[PDB]
Amino acid sequence: GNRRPIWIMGHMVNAIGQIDEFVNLGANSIETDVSFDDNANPEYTYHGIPCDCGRNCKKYENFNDFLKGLRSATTPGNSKYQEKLVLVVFDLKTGSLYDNQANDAGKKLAKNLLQHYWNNGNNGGRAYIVLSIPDLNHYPLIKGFKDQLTKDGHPELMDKVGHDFSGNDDIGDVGKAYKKAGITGHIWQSDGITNCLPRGLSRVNAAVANRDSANGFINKVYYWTVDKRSTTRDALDAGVDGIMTNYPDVITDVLNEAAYKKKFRVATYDDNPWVTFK
Ligand SMILES: NC1(CO)COP(=O)(O)OC1
Numbered sequence: 353g354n355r356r357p358i359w360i361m362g363h364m365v366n367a368i369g370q371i372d373e374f375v376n377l378g379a380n381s382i383e384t385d386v387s388f389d390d391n392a393n394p395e396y397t398y399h400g401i402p403c404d405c406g407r408n409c410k411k412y413e414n415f416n417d418f419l420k421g422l423r424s425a426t427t428p429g430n431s432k433y434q435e436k437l438v439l440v441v442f443d444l445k446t447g448s449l450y451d452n453q454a455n456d457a458g459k460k461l462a463k464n465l466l467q468h469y470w471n472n473g474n475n476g477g478r479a480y481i482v483l484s485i486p487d488l489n490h491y492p493l494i495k496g497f498k499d500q501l502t503k504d505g506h507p508e509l510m511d512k513v514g515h516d517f518s519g520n521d522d523i524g525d526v527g528k529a530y531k532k533a534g535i536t537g538h539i540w541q542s543d544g545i546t547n548c549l550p551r552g553l554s555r556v557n558a559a560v561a562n563r564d565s566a567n568g569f570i571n572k573v574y575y576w577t578v579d580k581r582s583t584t585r586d587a588l589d590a591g592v593d594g595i596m597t598n599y600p601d602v603i604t605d606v607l608n609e610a611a612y613k614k615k616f617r618v619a620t621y622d623d624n625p626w627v628t629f630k
Pocket residue numbers: 364383385399404443484518542544576
């Protein structure tokens with residue numbers, strides 16, 4: 353059959369200069385951490401210690417500066433345009449917020465993305481965006497984000513927006529969270545653990561099983577963080593759609609192996625990230 357399109361997701365891409373670094377190593381997507389201030393406004397692209405093994409944890413930007421850089425990287429005609437960069441996952445570090453600030457945080461995020469990434473609809477960045485939320489109880493962030501885009505007069509940008517709950521919750525609990533949020537597509541399911549620790553495939557297999565069932569709710573599955581060729585082959589063998597990595601070149605090398613070239617290909621802008629692969 354057709355090759356499954358694969359997102360090679362650069363991990364912890366939090367300084368503007370790292371966007372090119374990861375894309376030039378083969379990533380067609382990046383993951384960026386978003387810290388929030390005491391008012392639920394996005395503040396920095398900052399992960400902080402502890403972080404993945406082998407990585408500097410403290411590179412960061414003002415969030416809106418990063419967005420402007422991401423916009424340059426994803427706007428056709430810009431001198432820094434990277435046609436290959438087609439998906440950005442924002443790892444929303446909402447751990448610092450009270451639960452009743454989740455909706456507010458979504459609204460503030462939408463205002464920043466609209467102003468600095470989508471440029472108020474004037475020739476903005478073209479990448480698809482995943483809002484990745486680590487706590488199922490923060491699902492009201494999604495409605496806040498959508499209602500703010502709608503108030504500002506750009507509800508159509510939701511077409512470029514998808515969803516992830518990154519806490520490794522039980523898959524049934526995840527689906528109930530989406531049901532409470534009223535979400536019925538554009539769903540990515542993360543599964544994983546820091547590259548510092550070992551992990552098995554039980555939950556990622558269960559996520560794949562949900563995605564490929566007739567009435568599942570997951571559209572795409574990605575495994576993180578994968579820095580080794582053998583783990584990459586395992587995750588591809590299990591049928592994932594995305595691999596998050598500190599080393600995009602390692603993933604690329606496996607995908608260029610002859611047996612994997614026949615079954616996978618690097619996703620491009622015309623691969624809709626919200627559509628389950630068949
Ligand atoms: N959110 C994850 C999973 O997508 C895990 O934490 P992280 O900061 O390593 O980024 C990726």
